[PDB]
Amino acid sequence: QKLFVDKIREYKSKRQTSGGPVDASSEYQQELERELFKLKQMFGNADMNTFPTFKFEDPKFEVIEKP
Amino acid sequence: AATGRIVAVIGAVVDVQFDEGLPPILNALEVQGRETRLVLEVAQHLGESTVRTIAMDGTEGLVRGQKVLDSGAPIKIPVGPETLGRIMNVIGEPIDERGPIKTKQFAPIHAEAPEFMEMSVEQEILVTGIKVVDLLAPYAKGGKIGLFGGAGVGKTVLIMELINNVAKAHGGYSVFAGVGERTREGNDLYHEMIESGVINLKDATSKVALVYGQMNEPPGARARVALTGLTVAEYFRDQEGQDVLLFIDNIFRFTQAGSEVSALLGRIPSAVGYQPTLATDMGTMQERITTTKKGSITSVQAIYVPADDLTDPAPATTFAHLDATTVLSRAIAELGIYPAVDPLDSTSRIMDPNIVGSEHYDVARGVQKILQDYKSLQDIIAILGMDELSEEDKLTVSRARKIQRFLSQPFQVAEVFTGHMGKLVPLKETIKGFQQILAGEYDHLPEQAFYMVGPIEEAVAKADKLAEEH
Amino acid sequence: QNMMRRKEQEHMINWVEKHVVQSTIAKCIADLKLLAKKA
Amino acid sequence: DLEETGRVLSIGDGIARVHGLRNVQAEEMVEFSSGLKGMSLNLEPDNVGVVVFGNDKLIKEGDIVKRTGAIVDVPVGEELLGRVVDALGNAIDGKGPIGSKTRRRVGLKAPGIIPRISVREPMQTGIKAVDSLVPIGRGQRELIIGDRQTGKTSIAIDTIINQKRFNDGSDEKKKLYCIYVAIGQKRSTVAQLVKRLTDADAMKYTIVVSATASDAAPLQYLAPYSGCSMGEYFRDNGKHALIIYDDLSKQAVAYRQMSLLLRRPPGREAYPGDVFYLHSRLLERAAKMNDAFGGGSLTALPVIETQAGDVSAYIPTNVISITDGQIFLETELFYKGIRPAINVGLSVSRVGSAAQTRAMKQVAGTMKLELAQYREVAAFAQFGSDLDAATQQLLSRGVRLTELLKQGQYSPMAIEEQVAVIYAGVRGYLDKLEPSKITKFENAFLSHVVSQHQALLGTIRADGKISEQSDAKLKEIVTNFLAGFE
Amino acid sequence: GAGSIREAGGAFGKREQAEEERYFRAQSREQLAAL
Ligand SMILES: Nc1ncnc2c1ncn2[C@@H]1O[C@H](COP(=O)(O)OP(=O)(O)OP(=O)(O)O)[C@@H](O)[C@H]1O
Ligand SMILES: Nc1ncnc2c1ncn2[C@@H]1O[C@H](COP(=O)(O)OP(=O)(O)O)[C@@H](O)[C@H]1O
Ligand SMILES: [Mg+2]
Ligand SMILES: [Mg+2]
Structure with missing residues (x-):
């Protein structure tokens, strides 16, 4: 049951992740920073971790009464 | 990695026979015993443990039996x-x-x-x-x-x-x-x-x-x-x-x-x-x-x-x-x-009104339409001549020739071919100038005023100079 | 949250497969038992 | 898992000469040791010629080739709607696997003589020129032929977007499921097309089969048949499908590559002897079934790119001979401002009025006769002011109807509004208006009839014809808006 | 075939070009002097 050894013994191996954020990667951060840069820059440019403030405009108007 | 021998050299095509370790297709092979580096890219497996390859440099001086080494990867x-x-x-x-x-x-x-x-x-x-x-x-x-x-x-x-x-x-x-x-x-x-x-x-x-x-x-x-x-x-x-x-x-x-x-x-x-x-x-x-x-x-x-x-x-x-x-x-x-x-x-593919704006798109389509109409009128001009054209059509031909000249532009790299200076026309200036030519705003100026100019202000200045000269 | 979940679970699945490659006469005997079980 | 195998004698240019495999069938799908797939096209006494579904750099001399025992098949079903798939039905849009239940062979035979009934129901495109002058019916094979960048894909996309009005309604008889097979295109072009179909909400009833330019020649070869099988699923189950092969020239090129590399005898333009057989057995599968077979249908819209308008080339000749008509596009008409750049003189629909509603028939017979007379006397423009009043009237009505046929991109019109507009045209209510305003009028008038006259449009749509009450009401609406028009 | 006569070259296309140039050099003369 070679793969069945794999499937349990490795998911168990990944489950031992108490201090592990990404299960002993030692890498993948060098590109994660790029992905999160691209993903964030294509969703916007401000800080997308806070609430947005709102500035609002008022339509323009002119002199309309009979001159 | 693996070593083979040249068995055929026809033009830029070289056959190599590997005894052990036939290289995959697209691998780069190095010919041994050459002054400069000659690389052969595998293109076909011919069977009988022979591969056909294309030479990246000249094949002169190659000998049948000359040693070829497999690099294990493409170039x-x-x-x-x-x-x-x-x-x-x-x-x-x-x-x-x-x-x-x-x-x-x-x-x-x-x-x-x-x-x-x-x-x-x-x-x-x-x-x-x-x-x-x-x-x-x-x-x-x-x-x-x-x-x-x-x-x-x-x-x-x-x-x-x-x-x-x-x-x-x-x-x-x-x-x-x-x-x-x-x-x-x-x-x-x-x-x-x-x-x-x-x-x-x-x-x-x-x-x-x-x-x-x-x-x-x-x-x-x-x-x-x-x-x-x-x-x-x-x-x-x-x-x-x-x-x-x-x-x-x-x-x-x-x-x-x-x-x-x-x-x-x-x-x-x-x-x-x-x-x-x-x-x-x-x-x-x-x-x-x-x-x-x-x-x-x-x-x-x-x-x-x-x-x-x-x-x-x-x-x-x-x-x-x-x-x-x-x-x-x-x-x-x-x-x-x-x-x-x-x-x-x-x-x-971005000549779309929803992308370049309706003004840009309308100006481009009007230019193309007047040029196609000029094409259609040139046959009548060959048969009848010019003096027997309608006046709307003489106007069409005038504006079309002016637009033809105005599409021309002097390049900074062609300064030797033309002697002119390089011009870099902004986008809004191009749209505005072609809109003004299509509207009739420059019917009074000659057509040689638009040849090899930048913005339309340069066409006006060139016409003024061409007049002041004669 | 999805993209970090995708890169990670991808980096997990190729880890766990690469991590058993590092890891049997019972199998060799079990293979012939399976070939007998072919019939 | 005991499998019959063979050895790769040689590999090159995507062709694997394979030893053994004594029991492999012709056109059977085999699997290489590297996981790649292939199809056995040449069964020769000493070897089998396999075409490789992928990149031949993974195949080496001596690799093991397994059989699968099955002719190529693809998943079919409604689970494919809204998906982008490859030529073999694998999802390529990253939305998970296709949860289909049924598989269908890509090389099944077309319906015979008896399972068919005449083509009688309209397939609305939303383009005024097509729906009025080159009508397409459900079960027809109408060719979209033209030079490059003349507006063929736009015609296909308008036809796909237009079916939203029918697919959102409740009339199950008028629903049309679309399939767009893209052969030999860029992946970014297909992504733009998929985005355009999603924005128009047209993906929920559309399948996009994508065999792009970097895919192997066997995949581009096979993609039209996969799409045709996915549409035959609907055609067999009482539903109606439309399929657009964009385009068949590139499939012919891919098949010619495969044949020339298999050392098959070349013919004219190096195409094999059975390229006509190829396109004909692909296109005869678009049929209209009788009620004893569910009443379903499959409509084919093959696309062909001609070089310099040469319709006497090999593949254009073949596909023109096979189909039931053609929509011809011209680049000169394109740059004259006539868009869609349909050449009405050359376009033809051998189904014809049998594929039109009675209202569109009413107005379109008149429009066709008038545009024909206009085409006859159109050379006399540039001199029109110096002929009879009848010739000048022919020219006037002709240019009015010509500007009446121009249409914007991605904006297909309902059949009722098309009929109202052609009515305003061929009844004379645009002769007093000068040409440069027609289009503008056509817009404003349209809005008018859409806003305050839903009753007349709904009654025409429900009746399919212009009855005398409908005729008179249309009359009054047109004359009122025209009198009150700027 | 809109510009077929002058795209083919030949006598009928070389005479068309000459006629166009004659007319418009005349008009450019009578347009410059009026500036
Ligand atoms: N009815 C239309 N109105 C305005 N523009 C149009 C219209 N139809 C097409 N176009 C434009 O003409 C251009 C070419 O059209 P399209 O790409 O659809 O035809 P094509 O034959 O498939 O081109 P290709 O050679 O790339 O396959 C497109 O940019 C399109 O936006
Ligand atoms: N923008 C230009 N301005 C002036 N002359 C030009 C220009 N482009 C081309 N030419 C002329 O045409 C000749 C050919 O130019 P080239 O760039 O070599 O064309 P190609 O790359 O197609 O062979 C040039 O030597 C030059 O005399
Ligand atoms: Mg060059
Ligand atoms: Mg296209």
């Missing part, structure tokens, strides 16, 4: 910011006499095209400063462009003007790939890039990488040098996220190179004498020149059109790989109008 070229300001050939050797290219990573020149889920639909107009391009068939940031033309219509001058304008306005590591072109033009471009500061031989802030395989190279080098330049640009796009410019001149040569070995690889010719694998080779090459979600590649490709055909299989196959084709015409260059862009044959 690997150095990639990185160290390639900027350098010139490499098809196999990545530095051919600028400036020493080795000490990058820290090498990339194989054969890779898979980006997937479908990696495509980006963003279309943003790239203003070049050229009147006819921006007006009728504008280029987009991250799109594939393509410049079609026969021999001597101005593909190189236009691609050099684009280099000048965009690349000096750009901040994203351009890459030029000379594919089967004149070596004289390569030296010219190298030195006009050094003197322009784009390539810096000291204090390495160079922003262009050059890859060159010219007309004197064997078919294999001319077929793979486009892939080499593509791989440099691909590293700049993926592993650095930068926005790359990719100039290729000429891409037709790539196609042509394949033909020059096709029958020697044992393949029945297709139509017009082209390899049976024309469309798929062009596909697997061009599908790698693309903008992905990881980066952007704007590519300008000069496409030679043999004998001004445009129906030859090579240009006709290239047409479907581009986003904004610019087709140069000899009938236009013989009028004296430069650039020789054909207004009724150029196309752009």
Whole structure:
């Protein structure tokens, strides 16, 4: 049951992740920073971790009464 | 790795017999016992543990039984910011006499095209400063462009003007790939890039990488040098996220190179004498020149059109790989109008009112319509003459000739061909000038006032001067 | 949250497969037992 | 898992000459040791010629080739709607696997003589020129032929977007499921097309089969048949499908590559002897079934790119001979401002009025006769002011109807509004208006009839014809808006 | 075939070009002097 050894013994191996954020990667951060840069820059440019403030405009108007 | 022996040398095709460890297809093999490095790319497994290969350099002096060593990978070229300001050939050797290219990573020149889920639909107009391009068939940031033309219509001058304008306005590591072109033009471009500061031989802030395989190279080098330049640009796009410019001149040569070995690889010719694998080779090459979600590649490709055909299989196959084709015409260059862009044959996928604005689109369509009407009226003009035209039609012909002249523009790189100064017309100025010509705002000015001017203010000033002289 | 979940579970699945490659007469005997069980 | 195998004698250009495999069938799908797939096209006494579904750099001399025992098949079903798939039905849009239940062979035979009934129901495109002058019916094979960049894909996309009005309604008899097979295109072009179809909400009833330019020649060869099988699923189950092969020239090129590399005898333009057989057995599968077979249908819209308008080339000749008509596009008409650039003189629909509603028939017979007379006397423009009043009237009405046929991109019109507009045209209510305003009028008038006259449009849509009450009401609406028009 | 006569070159296309140039050099003369 070679793969069945794999499937349990490795998911168990990944489950031992108490201090592990990404299960002993030692890498993948060098590109994660790029992905999160691209993903964030294509969703916007401000800080997308806070609430947005709102500035609002008022339509323009002119002199309309009979001159 | 594995060692074999040359068993046949016919032209640029070499057969190698491996006793142990037949190399996969597309591997690079090194011939042992040669002064300069000769590389053979595997193309076919012939059976009986023999492989057919294409030579990247000359095959003279090769002997049957000469030892060939397997590298275990395709041609690997150095990639990185160290390639900027350098010139490499098809196999990545530095051919600028400036020493080795000490990058820290090498990339194989054969890779898979980006997937479908990696495509980006963003279309943003790239203003070049050229009147006819921006007006009728504008280029987009991250799109594939393509410049079609026969021999001597101005593909190189236009691609050099684009280099000048965009690349000096750009901040994203351009890459030029000379594919089967004149070596004289390569030296010219190298030195006009050094003197322009784009390539810096000291204090390495160079922003262009050059890859060159010219007309004197064997078919294999001319077929793979486009892939080499593509791989440099691909590293700049993926592993650095930068926005790359990719100039290729000429891409037709790539196609042509394949033909020059096709029958020697044992393949029945297709139509017009082209390899049976024309469309798929062009596909697997061009599908790698693309903008992905990881980066952007704007590519300008000069496409030679043999004998001004445009129906030859090579240009006709290239047409479907581009986003904004610019087709140069000899009938236009013989009028004296430069650039020789054909207004009724150029196309752009961003010539859409929802993209360029309704004013831009309406002006472009009005220009194209009045030029088509001029075409239709020229027959009547040949038969009847000019004096028997309707007055609306004389007005049409006048405005059409004026628009023809105004689409012309003096280039900064053609200052020797014309003696004129270079002009870089902004987009709004182009739209405004052509709208004003179409509206009739300049019916009183002559037509030679619009020949080789920038904005319309220059047409007015030139008319005033032409009058003040006589 | 999805993209970080995708890169991670991808970096997990190729880890766990690469991590058993580092890891049997019972199998060789079991193979012939399976070939007998072919019938 | 005991499998019959063979050895790769040789590999090159995507062709594997394979030893053994004594029991492999013709056109059977085999699997290489590297996981790649292939199809056995040449069964020769000493070897089998396998075409490789991928890149031949993974195949080496000596690799093991397994059989699968099955002719190529693809998943079919409604689970494919809204998906982008490859030529073999694998999802390429990253939205998970296709949860289909049924598989169908890509090389099944077309319905015979008896299972068919005449083509009688309209397939609305939303383009005024097509729906009025070149009508397409459900079960027809109408060719979209033209030069490059003349507006063919736009016609296909308008036809796909237009079916939203029918697919959002409740009338199950009028629903049309679309399939867009893209052969030899860029992946970014297909992504733009998919985005355009999603924005128009047209993906929920559309399948997009994508065999792009970097895919192997066998995949581009096979993609039209995969799409045709996915549409035959609907055609067999009482539903109605439309399929657009964009385009068949590139499939012919891919098949020619495969044949030339298999050393099959070349013919004219190096195409094999059975390229006509190829396109004909692909296109005869678009049929209209009788009620005894569910009443379903499959409509084919093959696309062909001609070089310099040369319709006497090999593949254009073949596909023109096979189909039931053609929509011809001209680049000169394109740059004259006539868009969609349909050439009405050359376009033809051999189904014809049998594929039109009675209202469109009413107005379109008149429009066709008038545009024909206009085409006859159209050379006399540039001199029109110096002929009879009848010739000048012919020219006037002709240019009015010509400007009446121009249409914007991605904006297909309902059949009722098309009928109202052609009514305003061929009844004379645009002769007093000068040409440069027609289009503008056509817009404003349209809005008018859409806003305040839903009753007349709904009654025409429900009746399919213009009855005398409908005729008179249309009359009054047109004359009122025209009198009150700027 | 809208510009077929002057795209083919030949006598009928070379005479058309000459006629156009004659007319418009006349008009450019009578347009410059009026400036
Ligand atoms: N009815 C229309 N109105 C305005 N523009 C149009 C119309 N139809 C098409 N176009 C434009 O003409 C151009 C070419 O059209 P399209 O790409 O759909 O035809 P095509 O034959 O498929 O081109 P290709 O050679 O790339 O396959 C497009 O940019 C499109 O936006
Ligand atoms: N923009 C231009 N301005 C002036 N002359 C030009 C221009 N483009 C081309 N020419 C002329 O046409 C000749 C051919 O130019 P070239 O760039 O070599 O065309 P191609 O690359 O198609 O062979 C040039 O030597 C030049 O005299
Ligand atoms: Mg040149
Ligand atoms: Mg198209």
